Ligand binder design. Structure first.
Ligand SMILES: [K+]
Ligand SMILES: [K+]
Ligand SMILES: [K+]
Ligand SMILES: [K+]
Ligand SMILES: [K+]
Ligand SMILES: [K+]
Lengths: 292, 292
């Protein structure tokens, strides 16, 4: 539910940029059948940036509806204003989601004390489990281990998705927090290393198109079978890298279309269509993963 | 003017975090009296991050009404979704603002082609002059000179504000753009250097509390009296640095309160009150500048 392979699922769109219910349904059936532990609905990969809060809620509600209890859903709920973050959380109260993935404020670059108050205030006004999300390359702000240790003492802050790719953070955080605080990778290419060092899972972009391998790899990692997991990781590694050859979620939406998982690879501005060179590189990485 | 000393004005708030009309009015009178060339309303320093679009529009129109034709007002109109950027801009069509300051999409990290499509689309849905704003440390995105060269050929994209502090960019950009394309520094500490290199002015955080000196320094620069402009700059240098000792606009808001320009130093979460140590740092820089 908060461990293993968690997908950061795309928000499939028609050619007009509106959510495509039929494509979303295919994806959810795909994850239920493939053994994905949970779905993150409307995070970065789900184009949270270019959906308004109303569309955002509709997509999360649609996802719960289609999931029909077969797989846990986590809603993305971050905002760079504490009052908006709180307010967005309230829309999901008593909805069926099992928790929230909430990002560090982007753009306004708060202090560590500001991060602590941001996340503490969010956790206060919900009964829902909160997972902190740290991705400094996008936000301009880095949530430090010391601060995670402070926040972990809050009852319903249950874990962190760490996307720096800085693997020393695993044990710096682990020393400061209780044994049931969940550490998740937010970086596909370093996620197996992350789990090998003590991590419990990954919120994965690769899982959109290689769900079964990711789930097996995460299960082997959790059992301590790292060599066996590493074999699968090597065949996924080109995907781990090339899904980011052009801005995420551009390559992965195109890959979902190439596999037939979604009807179109349409995105919203300022995301733009994949280049021909991009297609060639992604295609080669899909073939290396044995998916084409 | 899109030249000289432009203030990135704080949005003064009451203890509730709502805009304080009397403080705003005072700040605007102060800039009219001090020779400030124009006001940027609700940019970063004016806490665009924690105002919703309606509050944002209210502050811009309030600012414009209080300016009462005495000084040009530039609206901050940045958004990381192109549709939302278009919609915020449209609020100010036929308003009386003289132009828009529009930041590169933050968080979602579009490609250079994405930035080109984003800004081109914004420019197409307005008659207002557009100044591009580059601040990679906040956005996760870097608008490169070449892309600025492309954008400079859209009729109503008329300048760039450059906050990297990478002084090389002045002449890389100048070489690819028209001689009437406006180049503004977005980094107080390097702004005189930026102007000595061929830059046309500064969108300043320092100008909030030292408007007279900043106005004078940019005038001397424009006349080529750099030795003299530098005397003022050395006086202001501790401010150019220490106004960022804690996250902007925490220290500048505190400085405004201390100088008696605003009633309250309140900000919206995740910005937090200046620390005791921060006050003392800021007080000292204000003394060095001769304002305290
Ligand atoms: K949004
Ligand atoms: K809202
Ligand atoms: K509270
Ligand atoms: K806890
Ligand atoms: K905002
Ligand atoms: K132009």
């Amino acid at each position: 539910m908060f461990t293993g392979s968690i997908v950061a699922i795309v928000t499939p769109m028609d050619e007009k940029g509106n959510v495509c219910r039929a494509s979303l349904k295919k994806l959810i059936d795909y994850h239920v059948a493939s053994g994905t532990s949970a779905i993150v609905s409307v995070g970065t990969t789900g184009e949270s940036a270019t959906l308004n809060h109303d569309e955002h809620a509709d997509v999360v509600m649609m996802t719960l509806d289609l999931a029909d209890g077969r797989i846990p859903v986590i809603a993305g709920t971050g905002a760079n204003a504490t009052a908006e973050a709180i307010s967005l959380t309230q829309r999901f109260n008593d909805s069926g989601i099992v928790g929230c993935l909430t990002v560090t404020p982007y753009y306004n670059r708060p202090s560590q004390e500001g991060l602590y108050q941001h996340f503490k205030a969010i956790a206060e006004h919900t009964d829902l489990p909160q997972i902190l999300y740290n991705v400094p390359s996008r936000t301009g702000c880095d949530l430090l281990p010391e601060t995670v240790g402070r926040l972990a003492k809050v009852k319903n802050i249950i874990g962190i998705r760490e996307a720096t790719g800085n693997l020393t953070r695993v044990n710096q955080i682990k020393e400061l927090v209780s044994d049931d605080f969940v550490l998740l990778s937010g970086d596909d290419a370093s996620a197996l290393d992350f789990m090998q060092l003590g991590g419990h899972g990954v919120i994965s972009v690769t899982a959109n198109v290689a769900a079964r391998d990711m789930a097996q790899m995460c299960k082997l990692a959790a059992e301590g079978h790292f060599a066996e997991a590493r074999v699968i990781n090597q065949r996924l590694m080109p995907l781990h890298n090339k899904l980011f050859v052009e801005p995420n979620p551009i390559p992965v939406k195109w890959a979902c279309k190439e596999l037939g998982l979604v009807a179109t690879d349409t995105l919203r501005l300022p995301m733009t269509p994949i280049t021909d060179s991009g297609r060639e590189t992604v295609r080669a990485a899909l073939k290396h993963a044995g998916l084409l």
